[PDB]
Design a protein around this ligand. Structure first.
Ligand SMILES: NC(=O)c1ccc[n+]([C@@H]2O[C@H](COP(=O)([O-])OP(=O)(O)OC[C@H]3O[C@@H](n4cnc5c(N)ncnc54)[C@H](OP(=O)(O)O)[C@@H]3O)[C@@H](O)[C@H]2O)c1
Ligand SMILES: NC(=O)c1ccc[n+]([C@@H]2O[C@H](COP(=O)([O-])OP(=O)(O)OC[C@H]3O[C@@H](n4cnc5c(N)ncnc54)[C@H](OP(=O)(O)O)[C@@H]3O)[C@@H](O)[C@H]2O)c1
Ligand SMILES: O=c1c(O)c(-c2ccc(O)c(O)c2)oc2cc(O)cc(O)c12
Ligand SMILES: O=c1c(O)c(-c2ccc(O)c(O)c2)oc2cc(O)cc(O)c12
Ligand SMILES: O=c1c(O)c(-c2ccc(O)c(O)c2)oc2cc(O)cc(O)c12
Lengths: 324, 324
């Protein structure tokens, strides 16, 4: 059987695609510029591409663009998302498109008459952006637009976009009886197939590379492996009884403990034993996959793995230095 | 004679302290954490650190904190600026203490009674952040606070905090007859002596790294070699005719000319010969340094010099890999 996957070129979706065709699906990859050898070579080199993979040219900002992709399949894995690239006008750049495009795809999924189920890949920033961390999070919890809007802290548009985009999504799925799952990844880390440094690993590797601007997203970290998160998606398409949301977080720990763990593995990098504002008494925050793990799904991977894969592949692809 | 340098541990600051010592001066370097080996090593290692360099603890978020270090100096080079580190509340984290900190550095100077001039390092984001770009900018251009605040684009706290900082200062300097200069650099690039990756190098090295978030600053880009920028801070302290604001940019080319320029010099890096949303009739926005060159200041280094200083120093220190 056929499925769509949007944002096929990127970090999650790529791996999602390789795993999808390492099973017996025949897939419809969607990208924006099919001629961007970087974005595409890794998808076509995938064993069984000639006989099963097809590419389609769609943009979230272009109303209607997804119909054909979605024509025919039993599934769509919406993994794709706008960045804040041009960085003049995020309301028009990142939010309008992430909202309208999403609802866009939901319409087109009905129009098909073939789509049995839609899996939105969502963002952890739809859960836990509020002025004070609960010590554990779960699928009833929603980030605070009042607080996001008032404050306008770094990366607000990737919080508010996906919170308005998932919110309005369920608002439709309930209203028009669409079969909607959504997975909520925390920081996705692992090996990867794509050509460049994936966006989520500029952040995970920040205790090595010293990119200060990222420290905040891992001060009280939570993580999955790219390979659990992927198999996790295929689980939730394939496992009939699934409703609502699904957090997909396998670990959680403050910047210091991740630092510790990288130091012991990687001495050849000069990793700081201190970070500003992080004491040893700072409570780790938790994202609970209990609802996932309740269904049957079983994390195969540990924080040490995600990272070995990230460091190993980066080195290989000559993105990270071998040492300092 | 004796000068102050605020945030001595940074990229700009540190190298300015190396230059001022070498030229005969006695430096009171300020930092927020002298117990931090990485910030402070590269300063005590300077020749003449023993005899002509003392160290001080000050933080712009602490009212009064620069009195001691400013005391006794003929000049004060206020270069230090807050980062959006916690990334919870940039109004109170970034802006308030840029501005308060600046006004505090001014009152301290007035009250030291030996400060004959205070050079402040502004930012280019004070000049040219507005909807549509002028083809040339000079010392009379200010950013548009209506437009930063109506849109809240990436980086907006960095723009506003510096524009209200530099503004409030001028209003103060005038009202009290304080000799005062500001230098607006552009994205500063070149060699360095700091031991971690300079934050602005994370931007200039974007084509090599694939840091898609940092392309907007170099899309219509401008530049200044670090060594010029420092000889110009010293030049403008030492030059009696100097008044008001003073642009320090020496080159201006679109992302395409930079990626091309690097590609010819570093074939071992795949650098993309194509950029999304950037065509070849995209004009270059220049920052007119003419006010500064009319005084007699002479720039000594080309676009290439900067990027071979930053590339070499990084390879040596091990923050950019040798190849792809
Ligand atoms: N990685 C993480 O730790 C993390 C954590 C939680 C959630 N997420 C979510 O996971 C999903 C994938 O993230 P990732 O790190 O795998 O992203 P990624 O590697 O950057 O891929 C994002 C993809 O979306 C596509 N894209 C950008 N603008 C688009 C538009 N207007 N229309 C259609 N596609 C567009 C890009 O593909 P083209 O360049 O081909 O167009 C890109 O490959 C996103 O929904 C994100 O919000 C990521
Ligand atoms: N670099 C550029 O291309 C660029 C372009 C135009 C203008 N500028 C400006 O030039 C200055 C230096 O830039 P840079 O690249 O050298 O940046 P940087 O490398 O990050 O240096 C900034 C310094 O500020 C100090 N600092 C941070 N927060 C502070 C606070 N809250 N109170 C007091 N000091 C604080 C830090 O030293 P400690 O941690 O040890 O205190 C740090 O070393 C800034 O004013 C910046 O905006 C930079
Ligand atoms: O999609 C992303 C996401 O959800 C989060 C995140 C993770 C855990 C949290 O607890 C949180 O509040 C946000 O970080 C990110 C960091 C990146 O560099 C890139 C991303 O794409 C995400
Ligand atoms: O810096 C980035 C960032 O902070 C996030 C983010 C973080 C937390 C979230 O919850 C979320 O939904 C997105 O995404 C990104 C995606 C990119 O392609 C590029 C980036 O540079 C970022
Ligand atoms: O993302 C960043 C950014 O855009 C700027 C910037 C841009 C224009 C300006 O005028 C200015 O003063 C600063 O500084 C930074 C400094 C850091 O330490 C870390 C960052 O992540 C940024």
């Amino acid at each position: 059987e056929t499925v769509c996957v949007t944002g096929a070129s990127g970090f999650i979706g790529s791996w999602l695609v390789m795993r999808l065709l390492e099973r017996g699906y025949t897939v419809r990859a969607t990208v924006r510029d099919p001629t961007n050898v970087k974005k595409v070579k890794h998808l076509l080199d995938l064993p069984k591409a000639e006989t099963h993979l097809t590419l389609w040219k769609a943009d979230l900002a272009d109303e209607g663009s997804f119909d054909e992709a979605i024509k025919g399949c039993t599934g769509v894995f919406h993994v794709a998302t706008p960045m804040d690239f041009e960085s003049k006008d995020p309301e028009n750049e990142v939010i309008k498109p992430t909202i309208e495009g999403m609802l866009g795809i939901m319409k087109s999924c009905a129009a098909a008459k073939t789509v049995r189920r839609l899996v939105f890949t969502s963002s952890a920033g739809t859960v836990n952006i509020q002025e004070h961390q609960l010590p554990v999070y779960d699928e009833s919890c929603w980030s605070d637009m009042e607080f996001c809007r008032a404050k306008k802290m770094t990366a607000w548009m990737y919080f508010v976009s996906k919170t308005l985009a998932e919110q309005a999504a369920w608002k439709y799925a309930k209203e028009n009886n669409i079969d909607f799952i959504t997975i909520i990844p925390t920081l996705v880390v692992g090996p990867f197939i794509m050509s460049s440094m994936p966006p989520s690993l500029i952040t995970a590797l920040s205790p090595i590379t010293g990119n200060e601007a990222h420290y905040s997203i891992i001060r009280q970290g939570q993580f999955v492996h790219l390979d659990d998160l992927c198999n996790a998606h295929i689980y939730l398409f394939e496992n009939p009884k699934a409703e609502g949301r699904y957090i997909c977080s396998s670990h959680d720990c403050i910047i210091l403990d991740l630092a510790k763990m990288l130091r012991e593995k990687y001495p050849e990098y000069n990793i700081p034993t201190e970070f500003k504002g992080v004491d040893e008494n700072l409570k780790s925050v938790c994202f609970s996959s209990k609802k996932l793990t309740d269904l049957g799904f079983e994390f195969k991977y540990s924080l040490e793995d995600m990272f070995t894969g990230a460091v190993d592949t980066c080195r290989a692809k000559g993105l990270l230095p071998p040492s300092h």
